[PDB]
Design a protein around this ligand. Structure first.
Ligand SMILES: Nc1nc2c(ncn2[C@@H]2O[C@H](COP(=O)(O)OP(=O)(O)OP(O)(O)=S)[C@@H](O)[C@H]2O)c(=O)[nH]1
Ligand SMILES: [Mg+2]
Length: 315
């Protein structure tokens, strides 16, 4: 039987990372030639991330820790063009590594909720020595960590448990939300992705709009749309790894002023789950299948999608 899955959710919620995991788990992963295609994306992500931090020190008036980094930051923009083409000279890596270890840069990095920074910024920058090597070939995890905004509709196919899956992925940014209707036909199940760690962030398209509140509005619209009455609604509360770290130091009251629980993972996670599930206007006739995920963790996604497939199989 053919099973059509539709991935929905706000931008950067993890939808395309789930797509990548299906290729890794169910079709032997990315070949060397495929990994090499992502080398330019890894380099682009890395240079864009350090540039975003440097940019933010200017707006937030944060000085470098050592005054010598001013020359490194000059050389950064001089040499950045190579990375945006898939090349990484030993001189550029040294410039980035020194900037990344500077205490003023690190101070700005730890204030990233005051600007826009890729979630994978630290992953790549902490691994600069490995990714800067000659003949560097991105690993599966490197590919999973890449960030490219999805425009259009991405369709991938795979076989699992004798089922032929057709998985559809759409862009989640506001400009792409008008395109969601084009995938609405014949959907067996929806996987709605939520970035748990978005609770203290604002939209790139609007600094006044809380990211998690926008996610709730989208989920409210989808879950209660009569067109999806007979469609299984699966909720991926994603980026649980980033949420577990963030909940220790960033109060959830930024998002939900009425939250009275502790700053611990289990209580706060369950509170967010209930906030989303309470948007369901048909609690007795419509079920939501909620899973907490780390979309970049292949082992976690494999077991979660195994459990999801059983629900789809049983209908
Ligand atoms: N640490 C961590 N990073 C994640 C997780 N899920 C996704 N990411 C990272 O977050 C970034 C955004 O993920 P992505 O898959 O592109 O979201 P998206 O929903 O497809 O975004 P869009 O196409 O609507 S603009 C990527 O760099 C990805 O590697 C997670 O569970 N944990
Ligand atoms: Mg995407």
């Amino acid at each position: 039987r053919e099973v059509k899955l539709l991935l929905l959710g706000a931008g950067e919620s993890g939808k395309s990372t789930i797509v990548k995991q299906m290729k890794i788990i169910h079709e032997a992963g990315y070949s060397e030639e495929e990994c090499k295609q992502y080398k330019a994306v890894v380099y682009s992500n890395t240079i864009q991330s350090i540039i975003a931090i440097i940019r933010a020190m200017g707006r937030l008036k944060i000085d470098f820790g050592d005054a010598a980094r001013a020359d490194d930051a000059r050389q950064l923009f001089v040499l950045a063009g190579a990375a945006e083409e898939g090349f990484m000279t030993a001189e550029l890596a040294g410039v980035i590594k020194r900037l990344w270890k500077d205490s003023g840069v690190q101070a700005c990095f730890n204030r990233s909720r005051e600007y826009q920074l890729n979630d994978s910024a630290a992953y790549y920058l902490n691994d600069l020595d490995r990714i800067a090597q000659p003949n560097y070939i991105p690993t599966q995890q490197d590919v999973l960590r890449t960030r490219v905004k999805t425009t259009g509709i991405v369709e991938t196919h795979f076989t699992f448990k004798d089922l032929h899956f057709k998985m559809f992925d759409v862009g989640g940014q506001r400009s792409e939300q008008k395109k969601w209707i084009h995938c609405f036909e014949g959907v067996t199940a929806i996987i709605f992705c939520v970035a748990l760690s978005d609770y203290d962030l604002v939209l790139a398209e609007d600094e006044e709009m809380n990211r998690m509140h926008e996610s709730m509005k989208l989920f409210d619209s989808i879950c209660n749309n009569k067109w999806f009455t007979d469609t299984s609604i699966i909720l991926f509360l994603n980026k649980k790894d980033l949420f577990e770290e963030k909940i220790k130091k960033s109060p959830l009251t930024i998002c939900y002023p009425e939250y009275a629980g502790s700053n611990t993972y289990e209580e706060a996670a369950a509170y967010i789950q209930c906030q989303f599930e309470d948007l369901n206007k048909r609690k007795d006739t419509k079920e939501i299948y909620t899973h907490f995920t780390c979309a970049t963790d292949t082992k976690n996604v494999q077991f979660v999608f195994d459990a999801v497939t059983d629900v789809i199989i049983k209908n």
